Amino acid sequence: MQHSAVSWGTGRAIARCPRIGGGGSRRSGQGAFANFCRKGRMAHPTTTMRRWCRKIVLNTRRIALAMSIAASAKTSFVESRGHKIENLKNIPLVVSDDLKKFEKTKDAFELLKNFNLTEEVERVKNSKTLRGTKGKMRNRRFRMRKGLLLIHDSPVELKAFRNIPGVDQLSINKLNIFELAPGGHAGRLVMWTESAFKKLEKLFGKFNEESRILKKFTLPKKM
Amino acid sequence: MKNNHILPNNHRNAMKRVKEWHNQPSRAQRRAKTRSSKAKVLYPAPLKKLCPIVRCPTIRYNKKQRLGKGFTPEELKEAGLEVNYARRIGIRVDNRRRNMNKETLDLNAQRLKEYLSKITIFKNGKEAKESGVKQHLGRIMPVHKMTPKVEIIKKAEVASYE
Amino acid sequence: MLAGRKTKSSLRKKQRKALFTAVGKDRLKRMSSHLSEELRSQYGFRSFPVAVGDIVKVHSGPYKGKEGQILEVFLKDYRITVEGCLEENEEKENVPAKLHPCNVTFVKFNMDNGREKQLEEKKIARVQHIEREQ
RNA sequence: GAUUCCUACUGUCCCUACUUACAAUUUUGUGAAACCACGAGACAAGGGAACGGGCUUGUUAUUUAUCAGCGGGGAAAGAAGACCCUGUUGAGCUUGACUUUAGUAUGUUUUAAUAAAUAUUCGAAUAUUUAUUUAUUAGAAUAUAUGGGGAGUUUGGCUGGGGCGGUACAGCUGUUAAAAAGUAACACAGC
RNA sequence: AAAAACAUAGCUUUUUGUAUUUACAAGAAGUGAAUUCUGCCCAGUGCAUUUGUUAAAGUUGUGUAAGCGAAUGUAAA
RNA sequence: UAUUUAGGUAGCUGUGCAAUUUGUUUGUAUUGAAGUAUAUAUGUGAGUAUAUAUAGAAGAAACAAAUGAGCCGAUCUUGGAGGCAGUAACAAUAUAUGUAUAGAUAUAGACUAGGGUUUUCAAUUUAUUGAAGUGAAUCGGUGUUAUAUAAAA
RNA sequence: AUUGUAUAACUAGUGGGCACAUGAUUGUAAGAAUGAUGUGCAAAAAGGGAUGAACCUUAUGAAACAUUAAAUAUUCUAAA
RNA sequence: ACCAAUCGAACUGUGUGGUAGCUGGUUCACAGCGAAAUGUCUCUCAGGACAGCAGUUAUUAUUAUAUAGGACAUAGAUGU
RNA sequence: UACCCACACAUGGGAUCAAUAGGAUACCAUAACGAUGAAGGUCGUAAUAGAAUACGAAAGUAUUUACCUAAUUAAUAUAUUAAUGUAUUGAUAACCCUUUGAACUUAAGCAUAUCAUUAAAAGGAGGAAAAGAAACUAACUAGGAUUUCUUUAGUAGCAGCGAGUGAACAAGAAAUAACCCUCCAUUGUAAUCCUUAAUUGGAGUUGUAAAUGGUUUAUUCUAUUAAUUAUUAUAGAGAAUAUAUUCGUUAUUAAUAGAAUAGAAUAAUGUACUUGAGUAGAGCUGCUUGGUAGUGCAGUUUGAAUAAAGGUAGAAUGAAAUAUCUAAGGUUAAAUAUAAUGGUAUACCGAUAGAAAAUAAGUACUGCGAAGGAACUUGUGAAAAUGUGUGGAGUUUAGCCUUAUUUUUAAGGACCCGUCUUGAAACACGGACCAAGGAGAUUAUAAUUAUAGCAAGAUAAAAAUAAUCUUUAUUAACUUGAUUAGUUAUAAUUAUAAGACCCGAAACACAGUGAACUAUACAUGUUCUGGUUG
């Protein structure tokens, strides 16, 4: 809308749309100020008034956390996701607490090698490829698969596990849903530490008891 | 307008002058940042100061107690502090307020003795920075919400109760 | 993002603008080369920028294995010319090849214009970094 | 400047004929525009949105694929009709249209001090008038009248096109009106 | 649209004696050279001159404006 | 188990095909991806799949998400190219040997306003490039004023 | 004669109509103007009136075989 | 009449994406259902609202001991 | 030979697909101009120089800075003795404080009203500005300076009571801080203040009073420069080369500048009973507000009392009780708003898109002037329109549908699409041809339908590690009073307001440019030759 155009009117064997006034170039005499004109603004321009966020009930957000946790103990829910758990020992699995003393990447890599947990590191690594769309030019170049999740108790993340591909870590206090059920399906392979697994019995209670940490929460019944 | 609706009342300049809240999570990070940076400047001292207890004015909130603004100097005269000395400790002083009762004066006078029995005083700031004492961060001795209690009485006294 | 800004960023176009429009000492360190193993025992660092006249050996590419001396350096192109290599033209193959200096490792140095002063300054600064850690 | 009649004069006319130059007709060079739903041949009558190139029954052209003329038709081409009507769309202009205003006239209050005279009301209060120098930048706030010199805006509907005429624009009775109820016309006779 | 329209000298009416300019001057209007003429009407609308109705402000309280209306002139208004 | 029902302008409802980007899972490609041009099969239809030629670097399918989400028309906007058409309309002096002998049309030359290298020469074909060229005590301005900014006569 | 009947909630388009048969009012008369009952065109296919929005037979997905209606049987044109 | 090819109120930028009961245009397939051009009020007659005609979804059976653009038997109204 | 069709090969043009040293939006930090000569402009400097770009005779890579320009041997003012010193002047295009101030539009017309305490225009400052310590709110068992967020609330109210407009207390939070002049300041003494190397020269009793040391040590934070980083990994963020290597990331130090806290040492300490006049308020008059008969402000006339006194308490005046405060002099941090300039990110666009500009773009070019203002990336090579070669039909008939191996023919059917319209092939309007672009999406408030969590209760309000709805229970008020499972979200439809499905007027207001054409007045210059009459 930068110019100062005005319609010329009828009686000239020409359309009614606004013409650029002036003279002396190829530009003068062309149309403007319309969605069907070249170098004209579009009708209904987008704006930042648009609602960007939604609102969900608080009691429903805690249910979806409680359900997706229980799916990680199920066998066929993990196998349908695509993880290779044929040689793993038992699910759910919980390692000892003395884990955050590791200060080198070489020591933490042996812990996955002590169990039969190496093919998840390799199947993540060979699956890197380009993106098919125009999003290559906008910081979304490569995409790969998702690997193991490790839940711990420390308020600061562990630097020993940061480099290994396909390993993510998350504290017990926050418990996002973007990790526990990615892509709208449940059944991620989780590994628990000792103190975090023992904190679950206060966090949710039984079927009759109330939760004391989460106020006004009780587990739903069976239909 | 060709059905059953209420009478709409939408003003003409409702959407022409708009303020947008895009900076809401970024503002709350800054306010906690300067609050934490102010705590190291005065290390052994607490973050907030002492406030009195008052009643709310109208009849809708007549049965509620609330943290007021400041202490009148007559309640400090009961505890034994002077107003140029008490301002240097974390105590708030209000001079516009007027004394009304005895019950609201004996309550605030008891509260000043509890604050004096906890604080200590060192010589200089070099001595105070060396001692490692936990620094309080919240409100200082707040009010707590009451729970109603039902009294059980015998059968005979209901003809002569008050 | 004017020119030679040296940023910490992950975009494709922001990092590539720092590669084209770099100047000064930043343009020198883009053209460095790997050390030999026996040279690594003498000084102790990994790499060092490239000057004119020192004997190099290609370790990767279609020209693998050949050893020659450096004839020219082109700062505007990040390319060098190595002796003994030939490239085809529309008239002859007497054109020397143009290589990127990240594919070459050099075998013997060349001491000119205070080159020994610079090499001994880096070897001093490296071992002091190791004493900070222990 | 507008109008009529005499004398002279003549291709204005009876009634047209002949000669020359420049464009045109023929050759080379530079080389456009308006216009274009489809147009592949043209007519008589019919019905149809009541004047067909195409639809229905009849009558008909054709040089190896041309060249130069002509103005019957394509209701030929130019310009979202200036005439007429509608719009609860405008603008220039006038005035005894509605509502107001700059300018101007007349009251009241503010106005230098002093002395004296006169009048009007009851020693006192008002008003008028004269004289002196100790003031004298020359104005301010309100009320009534005048005020197309200016400023905004308006100037119904129905109607065998609009205007002029009437109100068929609100109530009541009989006929139109066709044996239950309901029903039109600037139709009838009236209040 | 070059005229029969405009202008012009000539004729007539009107305002101003405190004009940087001074009544043979300075502003406002109508007809249109010369010759010969320029009749009657002031009820209507205007214009001029002169002695019933009508606002506010002030004072213990009271009183007083212009204008409109009425009378007399005026038609080369 | 429609032996009963099936047209349809304005209009209301249901089942489906095409395009761009986002999370998860599965897979293709330098013995050759995307695009484009011709065939064949298949679907009532929006459409889809394969084969051959060309070209040279990235694209497809399933479960969910976000919309700048499907053209014959607006005397629609911008670009490219037709018919009429080689048609209208304009330009067209003589010599057997010539830097000459003749013919033909048009008055000519200086100061100011405006133009700014068009001036002159060389080389290559009213063009292109490159050099050279403007000399003032007495020729203009700079000075005075036109009843609180005025003269190239 | 009819296997259903009855009741609520939400919401679109339209308010310039014309023709045939029967019977009327004004007008000399009109393919003129204005009312009453039924059915149509608008929004309705095929066959016949040579051709025609409303006339005459006649209810609706893709096809094949036999029987009729409206109308016709010298020739164009199926049929003494 | 004239005031830069413009004059019964010149030219340039902004309020401005000025208002329009008025002309013009509005983008893929199949299936189920399917209209009005009439009454009252309106500074109303080229426009609106309420009523009528239509669609979508829902609950329920002696409201079949019930309904009908029907007929018959009986009792009646009318002034062409 | 021309006209038509089929196939193969070549011209013309730049569509499709893929890439990208460019743009757009949100957040964070900064918030630094000028007489010691700014912003902007004109002319010059390269060994061989035009555009762009950088730079001033020290001129195409820590100093200099040609000429105009506020442009200054000045102007408006103060101090000392006509001269000398000091302070102001210009730029802004977002936020802040004052002055002045419209109309288009809505009311289906229009004149009070609304748009609007708006746009344009003028004056004045800072990194923020303005405000700020009750001549308050209330009727309680009472609260306590300013500012900002939630809520009260589209409520009380205002208005041709029409269209429409519109506040505050209480309650929950972020952030907190109070002070100084105006008398008679110990009169056993101006004890003060500017200037000078100097009680040197002044000011001042019509009343001035102003304590001082920056040395050193330690700690923390910010900004800018310089250095070292494995090939196992405190380094799998990303780029570049070829089909195993580097810059970095990650993690550490150094130097300079600035800020804050603490310790040690050096300097320094008397007496102080002030309360605000041509103000506050009345009469007439105009603007403003939701303020209704002032809520607030101003012009003119008039004009008080001093704590034994004065002001206020949501219909008017007069009077009375009960509460609660003290005006007319001055300063003030934090929580808050937003550009130029520099950074970081993303479900944004991918060359007719994104800014007008992938930059020799505010450039070429136009206008007397105010002003107006484009095209162009790299590989692939679609359609419209043409050329050459081979094959085939006929001269009486373009293209389409059905049935047929007489398919470059035969028999039947068949007027050109879109659109207003009772009715279109119409002698009714738009359309010569191809490609790309192109119109019911977004937000606020209500209601119905489908789905999810809890249920006599329901909830991501602001913030940090309360309220609202069921249900104001009716009435104008007094007098009186149990009862229809809800509330919070996601999606589709409808209604009203926002530019509001897209394109289109004749007009109105605000702020500026033109007498080179043409008109009038004033000053200064120039204006050819031959006859007739009397």
Ligand SMILES: [Mg+2]
């Ligand atoms: Mg654009």
Ligand SMILES: [Mg+2]
């Ligand atoms: Mg793609």
Ligand SMILES: [Mg+2]
């Ligand atoms: Mg000729």
Ligand SMILES: [Mg+2]
């Ligand atoms: Mg004919």
Ligand SMILES: [Mg+2]
């Ligand atoms: Mg006929």
Ligand SMILES: [Mg+2]
């Ligand atoms: Mg011919």
Ligand SMILES: [Mg+2]
């Ligand atoms: Mg017209």
Ligand SMILES: [Mg+2]
């Ligand atoms: Mg009307």
Ligand SMILES: [Mg+2]
């Ligand atoms: Mg008007």
Ligand SMILES: [Mg+2]
């Ligand atoms: Mg008027």
Ligand SMILES: [Mg+2]
């Ligand atoms: Mg009429």
Ligand SMILES: [Mg+2]
């Ligand atoms: Mg003449």
Ligand SMILES: [Mg+2]
């Ligand atoms: Mg003429």
Ligand SMILES: [Mg+2]
């Ligand atoms: Mg005359």
Ligand SMILES: [Mg+2]
């Ligand atoms: Mg005469």
Ligand SMILES: [Mg+2]
């Ligand atoms: Mg008279």
